[PDB]
Structures are given as C-alpha cells and as structure tokens.
Amino acid sequence: SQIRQNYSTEVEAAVNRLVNLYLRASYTYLSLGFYFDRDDVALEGVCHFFRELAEEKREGAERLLKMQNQRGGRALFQDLQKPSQDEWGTTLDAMKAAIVLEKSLNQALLDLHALGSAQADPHLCDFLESHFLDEEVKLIKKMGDHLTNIQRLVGSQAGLGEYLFERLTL
Amino acid sequence: SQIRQNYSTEVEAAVNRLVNLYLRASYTYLSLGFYFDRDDVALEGVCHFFRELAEEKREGAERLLKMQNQRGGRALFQDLQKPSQDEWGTTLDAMKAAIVLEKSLNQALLDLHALGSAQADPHLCDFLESHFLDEEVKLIKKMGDHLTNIQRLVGSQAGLGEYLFERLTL
Amino acid sequence: SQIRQNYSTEVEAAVNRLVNLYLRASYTYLSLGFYFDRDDVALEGVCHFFRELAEEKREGAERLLKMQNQRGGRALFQDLQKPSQDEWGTTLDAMKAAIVLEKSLNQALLDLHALGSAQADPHLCDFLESHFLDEEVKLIKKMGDHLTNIQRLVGSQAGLGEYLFERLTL
Amino acid sequence: SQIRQNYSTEVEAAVNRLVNLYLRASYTYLSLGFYFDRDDVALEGVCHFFRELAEEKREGAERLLKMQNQRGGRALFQDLQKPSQDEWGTTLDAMKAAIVLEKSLNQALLDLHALGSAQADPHLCDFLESHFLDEEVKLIKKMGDHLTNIQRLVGSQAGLGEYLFERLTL
Amino acid sequence: SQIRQNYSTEVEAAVNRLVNLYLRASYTYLSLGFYFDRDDVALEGVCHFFRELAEEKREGAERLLKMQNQRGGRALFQDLQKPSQDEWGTTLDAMKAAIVLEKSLNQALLDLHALGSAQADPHLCDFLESHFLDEEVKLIKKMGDHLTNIQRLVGSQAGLGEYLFERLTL
C-alpha cells in the first residue's frame, strides 16, 4: 500500500476482528429489537432501545472500516455468527444480555488499544479514544443504570414493573 | 348497469354483506365506547380508543359502498344487529371482544378477496388490498399488543393496572 | 348510580329510544346518500345533501348518549331497522321521504320534551332545547324550502328541473 | 323597585338562600383546598382541584347576586357557616364529601327551578338553565368519574394509588 | 436482455398491443376534442373534456412503454388507426362513443391482467393495479354519470339541455 505508514499487520487483523465483533453486536441488537416487538411481548420502548443500539453498532463497524482504509489496511469480512438466543426472556434478561455484549465489545476495544500501544500506533489509539472508548463507557453505565432500575421495579409485581419501566424510562 | 363490467353478482352480494359487517362493527364499537364512558367505569382513554374505532369502521363501510357504486353494483342495506353485549366487563374483556370482532372482520375481507380471485376481479382485489387488508392487519397487531400489555398489568393489582394502562398507553 | 339525580327511569328509556330513532335516521340518510350516487341516478348534489344529513343524525345520536351517561343513565342499544326503501325514486320523492323522517324525528323530540316536563327534569329540557329542537326546526324549514323549489321546477320538464335544482341549489 | 316585573318575593328569598348555599360551598372547597396543601398531606393536584372549585362556586354566587339585582331583587347576606370538617381524611373521603356538596348544591338549584315554574318566571328558569343546571351536571359526573377512579386504585396499595391518582389524573 | 427476468414474450406482445390501443384511444379523443371545438358545434366544455382525456390516454401509453423497458421488453409500434368517425354528432352520441372506447380499453387491461396471472408475473399485475385498473373504473363511472345527466336533460329541449350540461357540469 503506497499510503500505509506504521500500520502493523497485527493492528490490521485486530481491527478486521473488532469490525466483525461490531457487526455481530449490531446483529444481536437487531434480534433483541424484533423480539420486544413481538405481539406477545409488546414492549415498544424496549424494542426502540435495542433498535437504536443495533444501528449505533453498525456505525461503529463502518467507522472502523473507514479507518482501516485510511491507514491502507485491507477489510476482510467474516461470516456473521447469529445472535446467541432467539427469544430474550424479560426486559431484565434482555438488559443483562446486552450489557454482557457491551462489556465484551469494550474489552475487545481495550485489547486493540493495548495492541496499538505495544506497536506504538499513536494514530490508532487516538482513534479508539475519540470514537469508541468513551462511547462504550457511557453506554455501559447507561445499561447498568437501566438494570438497577429494572431490578428495583421487579422485586414484587414484575408485569407492572416491566410495564412501568418501559413506559416511564424508555 | 351501463358501466358494470366484469362485476359478478357474487362479488356484488358479498360486498353488500361486508358493508353490513362493517356497519355492525362500527355499531359495536359505539356501544364499547359509551360503556367505558359510564360514570361507574370511567376509563376515558379506553372510551376514546373504541370511539375512534367506531368511526374507522363506519368509514370502511362508506368506502365499500362508494366502490360498489363505482363498479355499478347496487347497495342493499340490511337491519343492523345490536352489539352482542350491553356491558363490556373490564378493559381486558372489552379488548378481547374487540379483537374477536376485528379478526372476524378480517376473515370476512379474506373471504371476499378469495371470491374476487375465483371470479378474476383484479379491480376488486386491488381494492381490498389497498384499503382493508393492511388496515385490519395493523389494527389486530395493535390490539394484540394492548391485550399482552393489559394481561401483564392485570396479574396482581387489577384496579391499579387498568388505571395505569388507560393512563400510560391510551 | 352514585351521580344519578332526578333522572327518572322514564326519561332514561325515552332517551334510549330516541337514540335509536336518531341512529335509524342516520342509517336511512346513508341509503339515500348512496342512491343519488348510483351511476344511473348521478345527482352528486343530492347525494352530498343526504350524506351530510346522515352524519348530522349520527352526531345527534352520540350527543344523546353522551348526555345519558352524564345523568347516570344506561345506554341500551337496539337493532337498527334497515331504511324503509332501497331505491328512492326522484329528488322530489327522496326530498318528501326525508322530510317525513325529520318531522317524525322532531315529534319524537317534542314527546321527550313533554316527558321531561311531566317529571320536572329542567336539565333534560334545557338539553333538548339547546341541541335538538332548534336544529330540527331549521332543518325542516330547509327541506320544505327545497320541496317547494323542486315542485316548482318539476311541473313541465322534470329531467331539466331535477338537473337545474341539483346544479343551482345543491 | 321601579324595574321589578314578575319577580315574586318567593323567588327573591330562594335566590338569596342559594346565594348563601353557593358562598358556603365556596368556603368548604377553600378548606379542602388548604388541607390537601398541608405538609403532612401534600397532594398538590388534589389541592389544586379543590382551589379551582372554590372559585367556581364564588362565581356562581356573584352570578346569582348579579341576576338578583337585574330583576330588582334585594341581596340579603347571612352568616357563612364554617366547613363541616377541619381535616378531610384521604382523597377518597374528600372526593366523596365534595360530591355530596355538589349534589345538594344541585338539588337546591332544581328546587329553585321548580319554584320558578310554579310562579311562571321564564326569565328565572332560562337563567338557571344556562348557567347552573348544566354546570352542576357536568361537575358531578366529573366527580363521580374521579371517585370511580380513586376507588379502583385504592383497593390494594392505597398510598401508591393516592399518589398515582394525584400524579396521573389531577 | 441482461435485465429481463420472468417477463414472458406473451406479456411483452400484449403490452405492445395495449400500448397501441392506448395511443389509438388518445388519437380518437383528439378527434372528439377538435369536433366540439368546431365553430358550428361550439361546446367548449365538451371539447375541454375530450382534450384532457386525449392526454390522459397518451400518458397511459408512455407509462406502459416505460414499464416495458423496465422489464427488458422491446416496444414495437404499429400504425395508429384513424378515429372511427369524423363528426361526433351531439354530446350524447360523443359521450356514448367515448364510454364504448373506455370500456374496451378497460377490457383490454383486464385481459392483460389475466395474462399476467396465468404466467405468474406479480410485477406486471401489481403494475396494472396501481396505474390502470382503478383509473379506468373511475373514468367509466364518471362517463356513465355524464351520460345519465345528458340523457335526463335531453328528453324535451335538446339544444337547451346540451347548452346547460356543457355550461353547468363541464
């Protein structure tokens, strides 16, 4: 690549893999989104929360491919593994599943950051600082907040709490 | 009729009958509407949901008579049978009664569609596709959603749930 | 009924019956409306006159049910008898049929008024004065005017007169 | 009185007495209003409902005195009896107390109406029809609705229901 | 054709033929239009009715050729047969001639629809449903209405009726 400068094939492969992790998450959020939209689930606020997250993840993916091309790296796409469940249970279960997903998305970003530090790729680290690290952190505290709120409303009347959470916070 | 073309007396009679089914539904929705408006029921959101549906049904009826005249068919009106209950019970019971009504309204439309296919009346089918099939489908998923939400809020505290459903979703 | 005050079961039953008379009239005006819309009748001004009256009648009906609920009375709906003709003849015949209908609607209102006076229900009478008595009176003089005009234009050339009446007054 | 015409001293005295009944109700609604405003009651929606009713009642009073002067009658004011309770209990109790008050205000109006009919005072009856009969009827159905809603939310969790009613309907 | 998919040479030839039927109708409506514009006919409302229909028909033709190209079919144009009369008689005769034309245009569309059904060309049928079936139906009821109106005004004074129809409905 005539424009490739200080872009180790190590960081190239790691950004291809987190590109896949990000499209995989966007795929899972789509499954969650359409399950809270099921006639027998009917939590339109929860479906709307996961549909927005499926798009935020696709966009992280495109941002990472755009950056891969900018550094002269080559996008290599892998098969997208299907969501890991077909039905998500209640909003609590769905909320817990999503924050596992974001924390593993976040640990993948932290790993790429450390990889950019070993290889001394200031542009790569400055990239993950601006557009991914802060976003994941805000998203996970946001989901931890929702989880704490759903857990407090779920103690006694679950149906009522799930309805109230969907109606009052989402 | 000087303008009647490919309009079988079979589809004529079937559209007169679904015209009646549609005015009958509009009549039932009026009864439901005024029952949630009773001083001892007082669920103004539920009364407002059924008053709007009584008008959506009257308008399907007029749309069908307008189309009957456009094809040169002759409107023949029958006595409108009275709603099948005087008091509707709770919002759950009323919601379940309405979706029976919409599904039988929808099966009547599907029957007319099949009748338009046997007789090869592309204009009649294109008509029921545009203005009735999609509308019934959206309406029934909308009512299935409400039912799932009322059933989840009704498990423990029914009074509270009925109040919350009426206040938060309608 | 915890809010029912000075609302005799006599006036309750009489308002349920005039509610039916009003939905019945709205049904008849719908039949008249769709008959002047027939391809072989084609008097769009006459169809438009009777479609507007079918809605004015439905609204009297809803006004009466709204008032029945306000006084703590219970709406009881009866089967709606079908219009009393399928084809209405000429605009003259249709106009004469409508004013019979309005005058019997008006005599039903006058009867309910007398019933509200025997039982001393100032709220019921004040109600029929504001929203029905004046409306019927204006409507019947309006129809008597149309009848006098159609009869004057119908003497010699009927086709021409019917066309002119529909074109110039409706 | 040089302008007094067909204004029986019977209707004069009865309008002076309903003027007192109306200032008395306005006084009671003020007491209810300030009790839901107490730091240990704190239901600002209920306090706001009764403060608005205390003013609607004062204005009925002024309307009646204005009409008494218009007919040449003489306002005679009596001592205003104090509200009949100092603390109103819960919103349910307060709501039940208010609708007793409105129904006795309404029966006082109906009595004055009958009195205006015996003495044949068309102006007096036309007056109570326009500004009091309809208002009381709408107000009592409004309070019957609130009572039905508070009673449904009060079955199990009372604190929660009282909070929800005040937050969602008032 | 590299883009031709499921487009039978049967439907190709049938759309070329209805393209011709549509340009032929547009040609006939042009002849009718210029005949009501003749100094010795002078019915500018009737000339304006047929000039607008000559353009609506040309546009159906272009819509059909545009669709033929979209499916990869090949437009094949045939000689346009001249209108079938040079003088159209009265507005009644001209109106009757036009509705024969529209009904045969409509039966040609219904035939193409059946042809699209045998060959299972959902795109072709969905095409004729959206842009031709509904249009022809509305147009023929519109012409049946005009015919009923002209026939009613033509009974006695024909000159007067023809003038009035042209002045009041067109």
Short mmCIF file of C-alpha atoms in Angstrom, two decimals, chain D:
data_model
loop_
_atom_site.label_atom_id
_atom_site.label_comp_id
_atom_site.label_asym_id
_atom_site.label_seq_id
_atom_site.Cartn_x
_atom_site.Cartn_y
_atom_site.Cartn_z
CA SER D 1 -88.46 48.61 42.74
CA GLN D 2 -89.21 50.62 39.52
CA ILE D 3 -87.75 47.79 37.35
CA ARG D 4 -89.12 44.75 39.27
CA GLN D 5 -91.52 42.85 36.96
CA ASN D 6 -92.97 39.36 37.67
CA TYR D 7 -90.27 38.73 40.33
CA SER D 8 -92.12 37.03 43.23
CA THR D 9 -90.78 37.66 46.77
CA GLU D 10 -90.69 33.81 46.83
CA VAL D 11 -88.04 33.51 44.13
CA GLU D 12 -86.27 36.60 45.65
CA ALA D 13 -85.81 34.79 49.05
CA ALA D 14 -84.92 31.47 47.34
CA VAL D 15 -82.15 33.14 45.30
CA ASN D 16 -80.85 34.86 48.45
CA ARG D 17 -80.70 31.38 50.07
CA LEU D 18 -78.98 29.67 47.16
CA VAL D 19 -76.59 32.65 47.06
CA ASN D 20 -75.67 31.63 50.66
CA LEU D 21 -75.50 27.90 49.75
CA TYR D 22 -73.09 28.85 46.94
CA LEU D 23 -70.83 31.00 49.17
CA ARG D 24 -70.99 28.21 51.77
CA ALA D 25 -69.78 25.63 49.17
CA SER D 26 -67.02 28.03 48.03
CA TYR D 27 -65.97 28.25 51.73
CA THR D 28 -65.90 24.41 52.12
CA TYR D 29 -63.87 24.00 48.89
CA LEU D 30 -61.37 26.52 50.31
CA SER D 31 -60.97 24.37 53.47
CA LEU D 32 -60.50 21.20 51.33
CA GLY D 33 -58.04 23.05 49.11
CA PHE D 34 -55.84 24.16 52.07
CA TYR D 35 -55.96 20.67 53.69
CA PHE D 36 -54.51 18.86 50.67
CA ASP D 37 -51.82 21.61 50.79
CA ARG D 38 -50.78 20.63 54.36
CA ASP D 39 -47.13 19.47 54.62
CA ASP D 40 -48.30 16.08 56.06
CA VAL D 41 -50.94 15.55 53.28
CA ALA D 42 -49.00 17.02 50.30
CA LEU D 43 -51.31 16.19 47.34
CA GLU D 44 -50.83 19.37 45.26
CA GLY D 45 -53.06 18.04 42.43
CA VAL D 46 -55.99 17.48 44.84
CA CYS D 47 -55.36 20.92 46.48
CA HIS D 48 -55.38 22.42 43.00
CA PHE D 49 -58.68 20.62 42.16
CA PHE D 50 -60.48 21.98 45.24
CA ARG D 51 -58.98 25.51 44.97
CA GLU D 52 -60.42 25.81 41.41
CA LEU D 53 -63.84 24.56 42.65
CA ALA D 54 -63.81 27.15 45.48
CA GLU D 55 -63.55 29.84 42.92
CA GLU D 56 -66.12 28.30 40.51
CA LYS D 57 -68.60 28.38 43.47
CA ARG D 58 -67.84 32.03 44.45
CA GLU D 59 -68.55 32.97 40.85
CA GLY D 60 -71.81 31.13 40.87
CA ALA D 61 -72.60 33.22 43.92
CA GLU D 62 -71.75 36.58 42.22
CA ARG D 63 -73.69 35.48 39.08
CA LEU D 64 -76.77 34.87 41.28
CA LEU D 65 -76.39 38.26 43.04
CA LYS D 66 -75.90 39.99 39.71
CA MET D 67 -79.13 38.35 38.45
CA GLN D 68 -80.96 39.27 41.72
CA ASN D 69 -80.09 42.97 41.11
CA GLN D 70 -81.07 42.70 37.41
CA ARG D 71 -84.62 41.57 38.40
CA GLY D 72 -84.82 44.29 41.09
CA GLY D 73 -84.49 41.82 44.00
CA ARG D 74 -82.57 42.69 47.19
CA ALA D 75 -79.44 40.64 48.16
CA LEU D 76 -79.65 39.78 51.86
CA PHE D 77 -76.44 38.12 53.14
CA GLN D 78 -76.43 35.57 56.00
CA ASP D 79 -73.53 34.39 58.20
CA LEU D 80 -71.41 31.83 56.28
CA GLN D 81 -71.43 28.53 58.26
CA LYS D 82 -67.89 27.08 58.60
CA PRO D 83 -66.91 23.98 56.54
CA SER D 84 -68.31 20.91 58.24
CA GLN D 85 -64.86 19.27 58.88
CA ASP D 86 -61.39 20.60 59.66
CA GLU D 87 -59.37 17.65 58.23
CA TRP D 88 -60.65 15.81 55.17
CA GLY D 89 -59.18 12.35 55.52
CA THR D 90 -57.88 10.86 52.23
CA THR D 91 -58.56 11.98 48.62
CA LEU D 92 -61.36 9.34 48.52
CA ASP D 93 -63.11 10.79 51.63
CA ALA D 94 -62.50 14.37 50.38
CA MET D 95 -63.83 13.36 46.91
CA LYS D 96 -66.97 11.75 48.49
CA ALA D 97 -67.55 14.86 50.66
CA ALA D 98 -67.31 17.14 47.67
CA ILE D 99 -69.79 15.20 45.64
CA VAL D 100 -72.34 15.27 48.50
CA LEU D 101 -71.84 19.06 48.49
CA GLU D 102 -72.39 19.35 44.68
CA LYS D 103 -75.35 17.11 44.70
CA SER D 104 -77.03 19.21 47.46
CA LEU D 105 -75.98 22.35 45.57
CA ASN D 106 -77.69 20.77 42.50
CA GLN D 107 -80.83 19.81 44.39
CA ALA D 108 -81.04 23.40 45.67
CA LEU D 109 -80.89 24.61 42.01
CA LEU D 110 -83.56 22.07 40.94
CA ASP D 111 -85.80 23.32 43.81
CA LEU D 112 -85.34 26.97 42.71
CA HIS D 113 -86.16 25.85 39.14
CA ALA D 114 -89.46 24.21 40.25
CA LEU D 115 -90.18 27.39 42.30
CA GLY D 116 -89.60 29.48 39.13
CA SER D 117 -92.04 27.17 37.27
CA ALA D 118 -94.91 27.35 39.84
CA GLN D 119 -94.64 31.21 39.83
CA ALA D 120 -94.11 31.22 35.99
CA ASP D 121 -90.79 33.15 35.87
CA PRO D 122 -89.46 32.14 32.45
CA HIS D 123 -86.51 34.54 32.90
CA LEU D 124 -85.51 32.88 36.15
CA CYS D 125 -85.67 29.34 34.67
CA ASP D 126 -83.90 30.32 31.47
CA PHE D 127 -81.24 31.79 33.84
CA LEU D 128 -80.73 28.61 35.91
CA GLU D 129 -80.72 26.52 32.74
CA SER D 130 -77.90 28.43 31.03
CA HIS D 131 -75.54 28.92 33.96
CA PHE D 132 -76.15 26.40 36.77
CA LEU D 133 -78.05 23.19 35.81
CA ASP D 134 -75.62 22.13 33.07
CA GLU D 135 -72.56 23.14 35.14
CA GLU D 136 -73.62 21.14 38.17
CA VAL D 137 -74.43 18.09 36.00
CA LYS D 138 -71.01 18.15 34.26
CA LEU D 139 -69.27 18.72 37.64
CA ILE D 140 -70.99 15.84 39.35
CA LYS D 141 -70.29 13.35 36.54
CA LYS D 142 -66.68 14.65 36.68
CA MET D 143 -66.51 13.89 40.46
CA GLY D 144 -68.29 10.53 40.05
CA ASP D 145 -65.59 9.64 37.48
CA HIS D 146 -62.78 10.65 39.91
CA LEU D 147 -64.47 8.64 42.72
CA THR D 148 -64.73 5.53 40.49
CA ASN D 149 -61.05 6.00 39.54
CA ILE D 150 -59.84 6.56 43.17
CA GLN D 151 -61.89 3.55 44.39
CA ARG D 152 -60.31 1.28 41.70
CA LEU D 153 -56.74 2.49 42.62
CA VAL D 154 -57.45 2.23 46.41
CA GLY D 155 -58.31 -1.50 46.67
CA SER D 156 -54.79 -2.79 47.49
CA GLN D 157 -51.91 -0.22 47.80
CA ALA D 158 -53.69 2.98 48.99
CA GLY D 159 -50.62 5.21 49.40
CA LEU D 160 -49.45 4.24 45.91
CA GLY D 161 -52.95 4.71 44.37
CA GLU D 162 -53.48 8.11 46.04
CA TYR D 163 -50.05 9.21 44.75
CA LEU D 164 -50.76 7.82 41.22
CA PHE D 165 -54.29 9.35 41.06
CA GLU D 166 -52.95 12.79 42.11
CA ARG D 167 -49.99 12.45 39.66
CA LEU D 168 -51.86 10.91 36.67
CA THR D 169 -55.43 12.27 36.72
CA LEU D 170 -55.08 15.60 38.66
#
